Amino acid sequence: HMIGITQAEAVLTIELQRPERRNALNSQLVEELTQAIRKAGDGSARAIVLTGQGTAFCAGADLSGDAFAADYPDRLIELHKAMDASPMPVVGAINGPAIGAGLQLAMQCDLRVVAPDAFFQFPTSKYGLALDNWSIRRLSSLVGHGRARAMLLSAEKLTAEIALHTGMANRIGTLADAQAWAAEIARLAPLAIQHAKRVLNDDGAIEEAWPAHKELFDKAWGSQDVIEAQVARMEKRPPKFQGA
Amino acid sequence: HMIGITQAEAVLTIELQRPERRNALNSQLVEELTQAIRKAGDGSARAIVLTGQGTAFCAGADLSGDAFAADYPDRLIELHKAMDASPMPVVGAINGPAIGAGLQLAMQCDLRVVAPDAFFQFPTSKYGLALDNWSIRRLSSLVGHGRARAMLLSAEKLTAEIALHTGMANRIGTLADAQAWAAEIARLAPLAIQHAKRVLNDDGAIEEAWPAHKELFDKAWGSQDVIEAQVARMEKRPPKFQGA
Amino acid sequence: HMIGITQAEAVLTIELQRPERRNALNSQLVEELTQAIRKAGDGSARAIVLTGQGTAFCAGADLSGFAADYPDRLIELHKAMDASPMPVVGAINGPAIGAGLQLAMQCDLRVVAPDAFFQFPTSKYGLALDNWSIRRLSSLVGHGRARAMLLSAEKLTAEIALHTGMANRIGTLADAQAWAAEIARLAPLAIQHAKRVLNDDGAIEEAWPAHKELFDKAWGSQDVIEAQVARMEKRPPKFQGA
Ligand SMILES: CCc1ccc([C@H]2C[C@@H](C)n3ncc(C(=O)NCc4ccc(F)cc4)c3N2)cc1
Ligand SMILES: CCc1ccc([C@H]2C[C@@H](C)n3ncc(C(=O)NCc4ccc(F)cc4)c3N2)cc1
Ligand SMILES: CCc1ccc([C@H]2C[C@@H](C)n3ncc(C(=O)NCc4ccc(F)cc4)c3N2)cc1
């Protein structure tokens, strides 16, 4: 009900379809993606393109109305595990802004073909949030530690142009470009690709949060500032953070 | 006496004031810098800007005249510890050259706004010495392993265009530029900044030296070549090292 | 007889000499190189320069020649370079591909001719790399470009190599030799320390159980046969993932 799926010449394109929320995730969208990823190649697909409808790739998370908000985090980890464990290369066609969970998702693709007007961002410093370790480590490998520091510590946006600079975007292109490239890849040695994907993903980015990490991470999520961020956004005004 | 402290709109600015020696470090300067970091936000400050007076950010160390010079190496570790552990994000305004101890200092800053004429350098292989591991890891993360190899194996300077290029510098600009950036960050959510800083610093660069590293470290520090480099300098001639 | 060695004031230059097979590494070429490096500085030299003769740095690997324990030899060669007290400046004069890219990355610094390029064409031939090749490559071009070079045999040009740090400088053999001569006037102990610490950034990594498995599946696959046959006949492979 919330995604689209088309196959053509060995490439399965999966498409987020919540353009009204700019493809913001919730319980259902994530669950249906998990499912769509696992069942790809069933199907004689050899490659996956992951993209979005309308202007954005994925603007973040929007659990409002989500009858099942509660269990949206585990749903999300499931999505990631599935992508990680997939023998298919996932070419993300980042057709537009990738923000928050949108950037996490983008980063979990195996390759990135990026639209001229797209940008990438972790605005967590704006909402008082805290990221898991994989996000922080994988971001740093993609834009370099220094840019990573500024995206994380000051909510700085990575432009398509600079994504191409750092390697976060592998190419700048359209959906069709991404799909054309995926076709080339679908014609390569799958086992070669499967080994490489796996070694690459095991570079250490998948990291258990240290105790100091889990502590500060708990402290931020449970904080009243997380509430203020949302209220202030509700009331179209700047948040007054207490650091508490 | 050896540093300056001023505050504006939740931004504490700390300025190295030993311009007659190009801000080179010693006991007093290191000691006072430590006190300032720690007592920052005591205070309503939610961000620190760190910079140097005169033409240079920090040109290294000058134990000349230093009475407590024996235990300076520990004092220096404490400064880094204090910075690493501050909940305050630290914006380095690199107003000019950062060499040796100063490059280290610059790297311990959380973000870097670099002046067009500033440059970075570990002239280590010229003076016959060896770095701690952190210095090498954090460098690699910021300029990339390729460029770190050159800076370290051939004492090559990193100009500001290239620092902007790699992420070593987040922006190119003035003390003022950095301060206005520090003002924006000071309005972000403190607890999200603190979590991300901790995890970013725990990327593995704070690494204990392997056995063979400490053997090469001691051998270099205890070499005849360390003296040759100094006398050759004092005689304005090419040094002629021995590997000993 | 398969490499050239010359010395000019503290700089020892080793040249690969199979331009007729674009400097591809075989058992004897691998052997003599290992030796040359071990016996370097014996010898007043303080820096080494490594380059290939003709148009290529190293086109890859070549088991033409009684060479089954070739994989061990090729590992000793890297063990030798990693262990060498002297810094090795790679004058990458032409394309470095496969084992050739591996050899280039084991150099300590790289001066790259503007016409060279780099490539693991490993996904075209259904093969798998050792972990170090993948870690060092990521360190040198960034994780993002490494995924591309690894998952679709993307070539890295001298220009982007310069951009990412794979290439320190774009220049000639002469340029590399001049740079080595400077490096040979710096403090050896300081250089030895840095080299060791840098090489121990974690890239020398043992394959996990899962990696070793996929590695074996790939190497022992039929798709390897199909890749060689398809290549030989200038035609697209029809892989099966088996
Ligand atoms: C194994 C492949 C893989 C699995 C999971 C992930 C990421 C995806 C991301 C949405 N995400 N969000 C939270 C988590 C996650 O791991 N949460 C548990 C946790 C506990 C204490 C902490 F301090 C931090 C995190 C996670 N894991 C990344 C990669
Ligand atoms: C925990 C945050 C942190 C603290 C300290 C450091 C750095 C700062 C730098 C000035 N610095 N200088 C010497 C040391 C240092 O760690 N010296 C001990 C040592 C022992 C054997 C060796 F082979 C090498 C080093 C150090 N550690 C980096 C990060
Ligand atoms: C210690 C310095 C060093 C030594 C060796 C290597 C590289 C060089 C490359 C030619 N090369 N080729 C095969 C191997 C290699 O490591 N083969 C053993 C192996 C076992 C199971 C696996 F899944 C993967 C690999 C290797 N290691 C890199 C660095």
Strand B3-8 versus strand B11-16 pairing type:
antiparallel
Residue B59: which residues within 8 A CB-CB, separation 6 or more?
B21, B22, B23, B24, B97, B98, B99, B100, B102
DSSP A61: B
Max CA distance (Å), chain B: 55
Alpha-carbon gap, residue B195 to A221, rounded angstroms: 11
Query: Ligand 2: residues whose CB is within 6 Å?
Result: B 76-77, 80-81, 84, 104, 132, 134-135, 206, 209, 213-214, 217
Alpha-carbon gap, residue C105 to A236, rounded angstroms: 53
- Output phi, psi for C55, to 5 deg: -95, -15
DSSP C110: E
Joined together, the tokens standing for residue A234 give 């509700």
Crossing angle between the packed helical segments B225-234 and B211-221, to the nearest 10 degrees? 40
| CB of C207 sitting under 6 A from ligand 3 | yes
Joined together, the tokens standing for residue C37 give 């490096």
The radius of gyration computed from the CA coordinates of chain B, to the nearest angstrom, equals 18
Nearest CA to ligand 1 atom 25: A132
Q: Are A167 and C153 within 8 A, CB to CB?
A: no
Alpha helix ranges (H) inside chain C: 27-39, 70-83, 99-106, 131-141, 143-151, 158-164, 173-183, 188-199, 209-219, 222-232
Collapsed DSSP state (helix, strand, coil) of residue A133: helix
A241: left (phi over 0), alpha (psi -120 to 50) or beta: beta
> Which chain A residues have any C-beta within 8 angstroms of a chain B C-beta?
124-131, 133, 136-137, 140, 143-150, 152-156, 166, 204, 209-210, 212-213, 216-217, 219-220, 223, 225, 229, 238-239, 241, 243-244
- CA–centroid distance for B68 within its chain: 21
Residue written as token pair 């870690």: C135
The radius of gyration computed from the CA coordinates of chain C, to the nearest angstrom, equals 18
- Ligand 3 centre from C204 Cα, in Å? 8
C202 near A205, Cβ under 8 Å? Answer: no
Q: Give the C-alpha distances (Å, rounded to integers) separating A186 from A4, A221, B208, C143, C150.
A: 20, 41, 44, 21, 14
Collapsed DSSP state (helix, strand, coil) of residue A51: strand
| Touching chains, C (3+ CB pairs < 8 A) | A, B
Q: How many residues does chain C have?
A: 242
Nearest-atom number in ligand 1 for the CA of A218 is 23
| Touching chains, A (3+ CB pairs < 8 A) | B, C
User: Taking CA B123 as the corner, what is the angle to CA B117 and CA B127, rounded to the nearest 5 degrees?
Assistant: 150
Site to probe by mutation for ligand 3, drawn from C132, C133, C208 as the one with most ligand atoms within 8 Å of Cβ, is C132
Alpha-carbon gap, residue C146 to A111, rounded angstroms: 10
Alpha helix ranges (H) inside chain A: 27-39, 72-85, 101-108, 124-127, 133-154, 160-166, 175-186, 190-201, 211-221, 224-234
Please, which residues bridge with residue C97 across strands?
A: C119
Q: What is the 3-state secondary structure (H, E, C) of B180-219?
A: HHHHHHCCCCHHHHHHHHHHHHCCCCCCCCCHHHHHHHHH
Q: Are C242 and A194 within 8 A, CB to CB?
A: no
PDB experimental method: X-ray
User: Taking CA C198 as the corner, what is the angle to CA C193 and CA C199, rounded to the nearest 5 degrees?
Assistant: 105
| CB of A149 sitting under 6 A from ligand 1 | no
Joined together, the tokens standing for residue A154 give 């000051």
Chain B CA closest to residue C181: B154
Q: By residue range, what is the domain housing residue A140? A: 1-244
B168 near B112, Cβ under 8 Å? Answer: yes
Start-to-end CA span in chain B (Å):
41
Q: What is the DSSP string of chain B?
A: --EEEEEETTEEEEEE--GGGTT-B-HHHHHHHHHHHHHSSSSS-SEEEEEESTT-SB--B--TT-TTGGGHHHHHHHHHHHHHH-SS-EEEEE-S-EETHHHHHHHHSSEEEE-TT-EEE-THHHHT----HHHHHHHHHHH-HHHHHHHHHS---EEHHHHHHHTSSSEE--HHHHHHHHHHHTTS-HHHHHHHHHHHHTTTTS-PPPHHHHHHHHHHHT-THHHHHHHHHHTTS-------
From C82, C73, C93, select the one nearest C14 (Cα to Cα): C93
From B124, B121, B92, B133, select the one nearest B109 (Cα to Cα): B92
Alpha-carbon gap, residue C188 to C131, rounded angstroms: 30
Max CA distance (Å), chain C: 56
Joined together, the tokens standing for residue B216 give 């090469």
Joined together, the tokens standing for residue A91 give 């070419």
Rounded (10°) CA dihedral B198, B200, B205, B207? 30
Q: Is the dihedral of CA C140, C144, B209, B26 positive or negative?
A: positive
Q: Are A128 and B191 within 8 A, CB to CB?
A: yes
Tell me how crowded residue C228 is: count the other CB atoms within 10 A of its CB.
13
Alpha-carbon gap, residue A133 to A77, rounded angstroms: 13
Joined together, the tokens standing for residue A148 give 């990573």
Joined together, the tokens standing for residue C70 give 């070739």
Crossing angle between the packed helical segments C222-232 and A190-201, to the nearest 10 degrees? 120
Q: Which residues of C touch A187 (CB under 8 A)?
A: 236-237, 239
Using a 10 angstrom Cβ sphere, with 0-12 exposed, 13-18 middle and 19 or more buried, the burial of residue A44 is exposed
- CA–centroid distance for A143 within its chain: 15
Going across the sheet that includes A98-99, the strands are A98-99, A119-121, A158-159
- Output phi, psi for B50, to 5 deg: -120, 125
Using a 10 angstrom Cβ sphere, with 0-12 exposed, 13-18 middle and 19 or more buried, the burial of residue A67 is exposed
Crossing angle between the packed helical segments C99-106 and C131-141, to the nearest 10 degrees? 60
Nearest CA to ligand 3 atom 14: C130
Final resolution, Å: 2.6
Within 13 Å, how many C-alpha atoms sit on residue C7's CB side?
14
Q: Are A225 and B167 within 8 A, CB to CB?
A: no
Alpha-carbon gap, residue C58 to B212, rounded angstroms: 32
Strand B158-159 versus strand B119-121 pairing type:
antiparallel
Nearest-atom number in ligand 3 for the CA of C215 is 23
- Output phi, psi for B239, to 5 deg: -75, 165
Residue written as token pair 């994780």: C143
Within 13 Å, how many C-alpha atoms sit on residue B192's CB side?
30
Start-to-end CA span in chain C (Å):
41
- Ligand 3 centre from B212 Cα, in Å? 21
Residue B207: which residues within 8 A CB-CB, separation 6 or more?
B133, B134, B137
B129 near B87, Cβ under 8 Å? Answer: no
Check which CATH number belongs to the domain holding A131 and give it.
3.90.226.10
B167: left (phi over 0), alpha (psi -120 to 50) or beta: left
From A197, A141, A94, select the one nearest C147 (Cα to Cα): A197
Joined together, the tokens standing for residue A126 give 């704006």
C30 near C204, Cβ under 8 Å? Answer: no
Instruction: Closest CB to C168: pick one of B150, B210, B220.
Output: B150
Residue written as token pair 């740095």: C57
How many structural domains are present in chain A?
1
Identify the helix (H) or strand (E) that includes residue C234.
Answer: none
Q: Is the dihedral of CA B213, B214, B215, B219 positive or negative?
A: positive
Collapsed DSSP state (helix, strand, coil) of residue C7: strand
C16 near C3, Cβ under 8 Å? Answer: yes
Collapsed DSSP state (helix, strand, coil) of residue C97: strand
- Output phi, psi for B142, to 5 deg: -90, -30
Alpha-carbon gap, residue C26 to C37, rounded angstroms: 17
Q: What is the DSSP string of A86-129?
A: -SS-EEEEE-S-EETHHHHHHHHSSEEEE-TT-EEE-THHHHT-
Alpha-carbon gap, residue B214 to C197, rounded angstroms: 10
A52 near A88, Cβ under 8 Å? Answer: no
Q: How many residues does chain A have?
A: 244
- Ligand 2 centre from B161 Cα, in Å? 28
Alpha-carbon gap, residue C92 to C110, rounded angstroms: 7
Alpha-carbon gap, residue B64 to B61, rounded angstroms: 9
